[PDB]
Amino acid sequence: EVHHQKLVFFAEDVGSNKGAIIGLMVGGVVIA
Amino acid sequence: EVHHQKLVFFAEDVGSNKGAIIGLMVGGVV
Amino acid sequence: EVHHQKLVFFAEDVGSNKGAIIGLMVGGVVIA
Amino acid sequence: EVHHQKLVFFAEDVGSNKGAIIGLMVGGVV
Amino acid sequence: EVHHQKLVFFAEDVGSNKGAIIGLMVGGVVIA
Amino acid sequence: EVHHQKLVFFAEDVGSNKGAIIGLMVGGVV
Amino acid sequence: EVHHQKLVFFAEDVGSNKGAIIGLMVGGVVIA
Amino acid sequence: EVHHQKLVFFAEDVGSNKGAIIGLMVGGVV
Amino acid sequence: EVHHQKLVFFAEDVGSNKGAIIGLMVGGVVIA
Amino acid sequence: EVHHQKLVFFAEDVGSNKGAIIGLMVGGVVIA
Amino acid sequence: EVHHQKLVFFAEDVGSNKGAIIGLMVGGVV
Amino acid sequence: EVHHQKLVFFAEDVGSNKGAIIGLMVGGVV
Amino acid sequence: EVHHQKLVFFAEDVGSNKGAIIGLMVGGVVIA
Amino acid sequence: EVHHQKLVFFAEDVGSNKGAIIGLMVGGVV
Amino acid sequence: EVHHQKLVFFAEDVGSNKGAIIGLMVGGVVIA
Amino acid sequence: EVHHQKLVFFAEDVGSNKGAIIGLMVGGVV
């Protein structure tokens, strides 16, 4: 089947927003 | 044959926003 | 066959907007 | 066989604007 | 087949506008 | 086979417009 | 086959006009 | 078909006049 | 602090002159 | 502190020149 | 100091003359 | 504290040239 | 503190050059 | 305090070169 | 100590060069 | 603090020059 990628991230604030470190490293290898 | 690549981030501030570290690294070889 | 890449980022600040560090690096390699 | 590339960013303010750091660097080598 | 790229950025300044940093660097190469 | 390239920015001001720093550098070589 | 490039920039100034930094440097070359 | 290149900038005028810094350096050669 | 950009392109034609496709689209903007 | 970028590409055509595809898309952004 | 921008193209001429395609669209504005 | 970025590619021919596909897309968001 | 990034690719063809598919995608994200 | 990022590829042809798939995806967040 | 990264790949031919699929996916995450 | 940006391409011809397809699109926004 064809590649289906879904990445959902939620980051809500209710007083003092800061922000954390979020790193998404996606790697794919294949022939042709 | 559809390649559905959906990347969504939901950020909502209520008091005072600062700044998050969002790093999206997508690498593909064919 | 049909590439559908969609990146949607929501940044709704109701208090004081600052500035987040977002880096979108997508790399594709394919033999023509 | 269409290449649908949609990049949408929603930046809303209701108090004070500053300056976010968003970098979109995509590389496609065919 | 056919490339359809759509970049949409929303900036709703309601308080006191300033200025954000947005870099759009799309690199595409193909052998003709 | 129309290469649809739409680049749209919506900057609104109802307080005190200033100056956003946006750089659009699309590079394509066939 | 045919390039349909459209750049639309909306800048409101209901509060007070100023001056945004908008750099439009798109480069497209094809072998002849 | 014909190359449909459209560059449009819409600036409002309600507050104190000033001037935006736009650099339209689009390069397209075959 | 000071931009020192230099583009040097060497193209020899000892066999037969033709026509290379060189696209120079550098964009540099700074907030004022 | 200070950026020093140097891109050097060597193309020594001795047989029969044609044309290669080389895309240099450097994207750099920074809050001032 | 002063902005040192240098653009030099050195094309030789030994065989049959023709003509290269150079698109110099450098955009720099503050 | 210098940021040294050196990118060098050596393409040598002694028979017949064609056309390689090299794409260098780097993104630095500070 | 001092970044030293060097990418050196060697491609010496003594027979018949064709065309390899090389994609260099480096992404860096850091809070200013 | 030096970040030595050295990436080297040695491709040598003797008869007839074709085209290898070289994909380097380096992503780092801090 | 400071990050020292060294990647060396050899690909030599002696008759009929082809080329294999080599994908290097490096990912690093850290705070500030 | 001089921003050294050196872009140099060495294209030689001793057989029969044609046309390389090179696209240099550097985007920098401060």
PDB file of N, CA and C in Angstrom, chain I residues 2-30 32, chain K:
ATOM      1  N   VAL I   2      29.357  42.838   7.721  1.00  0.00           N
ATOM      2  CA  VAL I   2      29.545  43.317   6.358  1.00  0.00           C
ATOM      3  C   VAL I   2      29.498  42.134   5.404  1.00  0.00           C
ATOM      4  N   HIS I   3      28.668  42.219   4.378  1.00  0.00           N
ATOM      5  CA  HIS I   3      28.532  41.122   3.430  1.00  0.00           C
ATOM      6  C   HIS I   3      29.614  41.146   2.357  1.00  0.00           C
ATOM      7  N   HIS I   4      30.344  40.045   2.259  1.00  0.00           N
ATOM      8  CA  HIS I   4      31.402  39.895   1.272  1.00  0.00           C
ATOM      9  C   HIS I   4      31.068  38.706   0.379  1.00  0.00           C
ATOM     10  N   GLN I   5      30.159  38.934  -0.555  1.00  0.00           N
ATOM     11  CA  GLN I   5      29.708  37.891  -1.460  1.00  0.00           C
ATOM     12  C   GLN I   5      30.371  38.011  -2.825  1.00  0.00           C
ATOM     13  N   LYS I   6      31.045  36.950  -3.240  1.00  0.00           N
ATOM     14  CA  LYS I   6      31.716  36.934  -4.525  1.00  0.00           C
ATOM     15  C   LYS I   6      31.391  35.670  -5.315  1.00  0.00           C
ATOM     16  N   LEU I   7      30.842  35.871  -6.502  1.00  0.00           N
ATOM     17  CA  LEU I   7      30.480  34.776  -7.387  1.00  0.00           C
ATOM     18  C   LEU I   7      31.434  34.740  -8.568  1.00  0.00           C
ATOM     19  N   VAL I   8      32.192  33.661  -8.668  1.00  0.00           N
ATOM     20  CA  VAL I   8      33.158  33.498  -9.745  1.00  0.00           C
ATOM     21  C   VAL I   8      32.813  32.270 -10.570  1.00  0.00           C
ATOM     22  N   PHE I   9      32.520  32.478 -11.839  1.00  0.00           N
ATOM     23  CA  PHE I   9      32.169  31.374 -12.717  1.00  0.00           C
ATOM     24  C   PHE I   9      33.134  31.261 -13.886  1.00  0.00           C
ATOM     25  N   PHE I  10      33.773  30.108 -13.992  1.00  0.00           N
ATOM     26  CA  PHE I  10      34.716  29.843 -15.066  1.00  0.00           C
ATOM     27  C   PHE I  10      34.085  28.899 -16.072  1.00  0.00           C
ATOM     28  N   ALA I  11      34.091  29.291 -17.331  1.00  0.00           N
ATOM     29  CA  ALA I  11      33.531  28.473 -18.391  1.00  0.00           C
ATOM     30  C   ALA I  11      34.461  28.482 -19.592  1.00  0.00           C
ATOM     31  N   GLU I  12      35.162  27.384 -19.804  1.00  0.00           N
ATOM     32  CA  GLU I  12      36.083  27.284 -20.923  1.00  0.00           C
ATOM     33  C   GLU I  12      35.366  26.778 -22.164  1.00  0.00           C
ATOM     34  N   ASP I  13      35.900  27.110 -23.325  1.00  0.00           N
ATOM     35  CA  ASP I  13      35.311  26.692 -24.588  1.00  0.00           C
ATOM     36  C   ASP I  13      36.415  26.399 -25.593  1.00  0.00           C
ATOM     37  N   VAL I  14      37.275  25.446 -25.264  1.00  0.00           N
ATOM     38  CA  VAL I  14      38.380  25.085 -26.139  1.00  0.00           C
ATOM     39  C   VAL I  14      37.904  24.198 -27.289  1.00  0.00           C
ATOM     40  N   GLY I  15      36.799  23.497 -27.076  1.00  0.00           N
ATOM     41  CA  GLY I  15      36.271  22.634 -28.108  1.00  0.00           C
ATOM     42  C   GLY I  15      35.272  23.354 -28.987  1.00  0.00           C
ATOM     43  N   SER I  16      34.169  23.768 -28.388  1.00  0.00           N
ATOM     44  CA  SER I  16      33.120  24.460 -29.109  1.00  0.00           C
ATOM     45  C   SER I  16      32.217  25.186 -28.130  1.00  0.00           C
ATOM     46  N   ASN I  17      32.077  26.494 -28.303  1.00  0.00           N
ATOM     47  CA  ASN I  17      31.228  27.287 -27.423  1.00  0.00           C
ATOM     48  C   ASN I  17      29.780  26.848 -27.559  1.00  0.00           C
ATOM     49  N   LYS I  18      29.031  26.973 -26.481  1.00  0.00           N
ATOM     50  CA  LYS I  18      27.630  26.606 -26.495  1.00  0.00           C
ATOM     51  C   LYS I  18      26.826  27.546 -25.608  1.00  0.00           C
ATOM     52  N   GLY I  19      26.211  27.016 -24.563  1.00  0.00           N
ATOM     53  CA  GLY I  19      25.423  27.849 -23.684  1.00  0.00           C
ATOM     54  C   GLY I  19      24.962  27.117 -22.449  1.00  0.00           C
ATOM     55  N   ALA I  20      25.583  27.426 -21.321  1.00  0.00           N
ATOM     56  CA  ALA I  20      25.229  26.795 -20.061  1.00  0.00           C
ATOM     57  C   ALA I  20      24.094  27.551 -19.385  1.00  0.00           C
ATOM     58  N   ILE I  21      23.335  26.846 -18.557  1.00  0.00           N
ATOM     59  CA  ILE I  21      22.226  27.442 -17.830  1.00  0.00           C
ATOM     60  C   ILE I  21      22.672  27.743 -16.406  1.00  0.00           C
ATOM     61  N   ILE I  22      22.965  29.004 -16.144  1.00  0.00           N
ATOM     62  CA  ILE I  22      23.414  29.416 -14.826  1.00  0.00           C
ATOM     63  C   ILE I  22      22.409  30.368 -14.191  1.00  0.00           C
ATOM     64  N   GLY I  23      21.703  29.881 -13.182  1.00  0.00           N
ATOM     65  CA  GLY I  23      20.724  30.700 -12.503  1.00  0.00           C
ATOM     66  C   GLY I  23      21.253  31.230 -11.188  1.00  0.00           C
ATOM     67  N   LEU I  24      21.427  32.541 -11.106  1.00  0.00           N
ATOM     68  CA  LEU I  24      21.937  33.175  -9.895  1.00  0.00           C
ATOM     69  C   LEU I  24      20.829  33.953  -9.205  1.00  0.00           C
ATOM     70  N   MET I  25      20.132  33.305  -8.290  1.00  0.00           N
ATOM     71  CA  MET I  25      19.047  33.954  -7.575  1.00  0.00           C
ATOM     72  C   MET I  25      19.288  33.926  -6.075  1.00  0.00           C
ATOM     73  N   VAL I  26      20.101  34.859  -5.612  1.00  0.00           N
ATOM     74  CA  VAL I  26      20.419  34.961  -4.198  1.00  0.00           C
ATOM     75  C   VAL I  26      19.549  36.035  -3.565  1.00  0.00           C
ATOM     76  N   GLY I  27      18.930  35.709  -2.444  1.00  0.00           N
ATOM     77  CA  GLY I  27      18.077  36.657  -1.769  1.00  0.00           C
ATOM     78  C   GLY I  27      18.517  36.926  -0.351  1.00  0.00           C
ATOM     79  N   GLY I  28      18.785  38.184  -0.051  1.00  0.00           N
ATOM     80  CA  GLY I  28      19.208  38.554   1.280  1.00  0.00           C
ATOM     81  C   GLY I  28      18.517  39.812   1.760  1.00  0.00           C
ATOM     82  N   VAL I  29      17.682  39.675   2.777  1.00  0.00           N
ATOM     83  CA  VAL I  29      16.962  40.814   3.325  1.00  0.00           C
ATOM     84  C   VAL I  29      17.144  40.905   4.835  1.00  0.00           C
ATOM     85  N   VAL I  30      17.212  42.125   5.340  1.00  0.00           N
ATOM     86  CA  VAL I  30      17.387  42.353   6.768  1.00  0.00           C
ATOM     87  C   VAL I  30      16.352  43.355   7.269  1.00  0.00           C
ATOM     88  N   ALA I  32      14.678  46.426   8.932  1.00  0.00           N
ATOM     89  CA  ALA I  32      15.114  47.805   9.107  1.00  0.00           C
ATOM     90  C   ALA I  32      14.407  48.460  10.291  1.00  0.00           C
TER      91      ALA I  32
ATOM     92  N   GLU K   1      32.423  48.806   7.307  1.00  0.00           N
ATOM     93  CA  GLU K   1      32.989  48.394   6.001  1.00  0.00           C
ATOM     94  C   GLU K   1      31.931  48.496   4.910  1.00  0.00           C
ATOM     95  N   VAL K   2      32.342  48.286   3.668  1.00  0.00           N
ATOM     96  CA  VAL K   2      31.430  48.370   2.535  1.00  0.00           C
ATOM     97  C   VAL K   2      31.044  46.978   2.045  1.00  0.00           C
ATOM     98  N   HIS K   3      29.811  46.851   1.564  1.00  0.00           N
ATOM     99  CA  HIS K   3      29.310  45.594   1.026  1.00  0.00           C
ATOM    100  C   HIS K   3      30.121  45.240  -0.214  1.00  0.00           C
ATOM    101  N   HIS K   4      30.894  44.173  -0.130  1.00  0.00           N
ATOM    102  CA  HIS K   4      31.726  43.754  -1.244  1.00  0.00           C
ATOM    103  C   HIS K   4      31.049  42.676  -2.075  1.00  0.00           C
ATOM    104  N   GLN K   5      30.347  43.108  -3.110  1.00  0.00           N
ATOM    105  CA  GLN K   5      29.652  42.200  -4.003  1.00  0.00           C
ATOM    106  C   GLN K   5      30.403  42.123  -5.322  1.00  0.00           C
ATOM    107  N   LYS K   6      30.795  40.921  -5.716  1.00  0.00           N
ATOM    108  CA  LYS K   6      31.525  40.732  -6.960  1.00  0.00           C
ATOM    109  C   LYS K   6      30.929  39.602  -7.789  1.00  0.00           C
ATOM    110  N   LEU K   7      30.577  39.910  -9.027  1.00  0.00           N
ATOM    111  CA  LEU K   7      30.008  38.929  -9.938  1.00  0.00           C
ATOM    112  C   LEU K   7      30.873  38.867 -11.190  1.00  0.00           C
ATOM    113  N   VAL K   8      31.628  37.788 -11.347  1.00  0.00           N
ATOM    114  CA  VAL K   8      32.510  37.645 -12.502  1.00  0.00           C
ATOM    115  C   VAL K   8      32.292  36.335 -13.253  1.00  0.00           C
ATOM    116  N   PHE K   9      32.106  36.455 -14.558  1.00  0.00           N
ATOM    117  CA  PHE K   9      31.903  35.303 -15.422  1.00  0.00           C
ATOM    118  C   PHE K   9      32.993  35.278 -16.483  1.00  0.00           C
ATOM    119  N   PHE K  10      33.787  34.220 -16.488  1.00  0.00           N
ATOM    120  CA  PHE K  10      34.877  34.092 -17.440  1.00  0.00           C
ATOM    121  C   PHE K  10      34.585  33.015 -18.474  1.00  0.00           C
ATOM    122  N   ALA K  11      34.137  33.446 -19.642  1.00  0.00           N
ATOM    123  CA  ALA K  11      33.822  32.530 -20.725  1.00  0.00           C
ATOM    124  C   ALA K  11      34.944  32.545 -21.757  1.00  0.00           C
ATOM    125  N   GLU K  12      35.427  31.363 -22.120  1.00  0.00           N
ATOM    126  CA  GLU K  12      36.502  31.248 -23.090  1.00  0.00           C
ATOM    127  C   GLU K  12      35.961  31.267 -24.510  1.00  0.00           C
ATOM    128  N   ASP K  13      36.859  31.306 -25.483  1.00  0.00           N
ATOM    129  CA  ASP K  13      36.460  31.344 -26.883  1.00  0.00           C
ATOM    130  C   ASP K  13      37.543  30.745 -27.769  1.00  0.00           C
ATOM    131  N   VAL K  14      37.457  29.445 -28.012  1.00  0.00           N
ATOM    132  CA  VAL K  14      38.427  28.765 -28.860  1.00  0.00           C
ATOM    133  C   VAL K  14      37.720  28.066 -30.019  1.00  0.00           C
ATOM    134  N   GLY K  15      36.583  27.442 -29.721  1.00  0.00           N
ATOM    135  CA  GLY K  15      35.817  26.744 -30.740  1.00  0.00           C
ATOM    136  C   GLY K  15      34.850  27.665 -31.462  1.00  0.00           C
ATOM    137  N   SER K  16      33.686  27.145 -31.832  1.00  0.00           N
ATOM    138  CA  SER K  16      32.681  27.941 -32.529  1.00  0.00           C
ATOM    139  C   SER K  16      31.841  28.743 -31.539  1.00  0.00           C
ATOM    140  N   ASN K  17      31.804  30.062 -31.722  1.00  0.00           N
ATOM    141  CA  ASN K  17      31.058  30.959 -30.831  1.00  0.00           C
ATOM    142  C   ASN K  17      29.577  30.610 -30.746  1.00  0.00           C
ATOM    143  N   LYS K  18      28.980  30.899 -29.594  1.00  0.00           N
ATOM    144  CA  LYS K  18      27.567  30.627 -29.368  1.00  0.00           C
ATOM    145  C   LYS K  18      26.972  31.634 -28.372  1.00  0.00           C
ATOM    146  N   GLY K  19      26.713  31.202 -27.142  1.00  0.00           N
ATOM    147  CA  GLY K  19      26.153  32.101 -26.149  1.00  0.00           C
ATOM    148  C   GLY K  19      25.527  31.364 -24.981  1.00  0.00           C
ATOM    149  N   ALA K  20      26.018  31.641 -23.782  1.00  0.00           N
ATOM    150  CA  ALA K  20      25.514  30.998 -22.576  1.00  0.00           C
ATOM    151  C   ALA K  20      24.281  31.718 -22.036  1.00  0.00           C
ATOM    152  N   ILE K  21      23.542  31.047 -21.162  1.00  0.00           N
ATOM    153  CA  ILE K  21      22.342  31.621 -20.570  1.00  0.00           C
ATOM    154  C   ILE K  21      22.571  31.877 -19.082  1.00  0.00           C
ATOM    155  N   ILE K  22      22.809  33.132 -18.737  1.00  0.00           N
ATOM    156  CA  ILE K  22      23.059  33.501 -17.353  1.00  0.00           C
ATOM    157  C   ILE K  22      21.963  34.407 -16.809  1.00  0.00           C
ATOM    158  N   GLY K  23      21.343  33.974 -15.722  1.00  0.00           N
ATOM    159  CA  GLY K  23      20.292  34.751 -15.106  1.00  0.00           C
ATOM    160  C   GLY K  23      20.739  35.333 -13.783  1.00  0.00           C
ATOM    161  N   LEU K  24      21.230  36.562 -13.818  1.00  0.00           N
ATOM    162  CA  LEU K  24      21.698  37.232 -12.611  1.00  0.00           C
ATOM    163  C   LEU K  24      20.570  38.011 -11.953  1.00  0.00           C
ATOM    164  N   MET K  25      19.892  37.376 -11.013  1.00  0.00           N
ATOM    165  CA  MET K  25      18.794  38.011 -10.299  1.00  0.00           C
ATOM    166  C   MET K  25      19.049  37.997  -8.797  1.00  0.00           C
ATOM    167  N   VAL K  26      20.089  38.708  -8.384  1.00  0.00           N
ATOM    168  CA  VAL K  26      20.455  38.789  -6.977  1.00  0.00           C
ATOM    169  C   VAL K  26      19.647  39.886  -6.292  1.00  0.00           C
ATOM    170  N   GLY K  27      18.934  39.518  -5.241  1.00  0.00           N
ATOM    171  CA  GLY K  27      18.115  40.475  -4.531  1.00  0.00           C
ATOM    172  C   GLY K  27      18.586  40.726  -3.119  1.00  0.00           C
ATOM    173  N   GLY K  28      19.027  41.941  -2.864  1.00  0.00           N
ATOM    174  CA  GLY K  28      19.485  42.306  -1.547  1.00  0.00           C
ATOM    175  C   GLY K  28      18.935  43.651  -1.129  1.00  0.00           C
ATOM    176  N   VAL K  29      18.139  43.665  -0.075  1.00  0.00           N
ATOM    177  CA  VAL K  29      17.551  44.905   0.410  1.00  0.00           C
ATOM    178  C   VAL K  29      17.330  44.856   1.922  1.00  0.00           C
ATOM    179  N   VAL K  30      17.569  45.978   2.585  1.00  0.00           N
ATOM    180  CA  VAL K  30      17.399  46.065   4.029  1.00  0.00           C
ATOM    181  C   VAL K  30      16.250  47.007   4.376  1.00  0.00           C
TER     182      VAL K  30
END
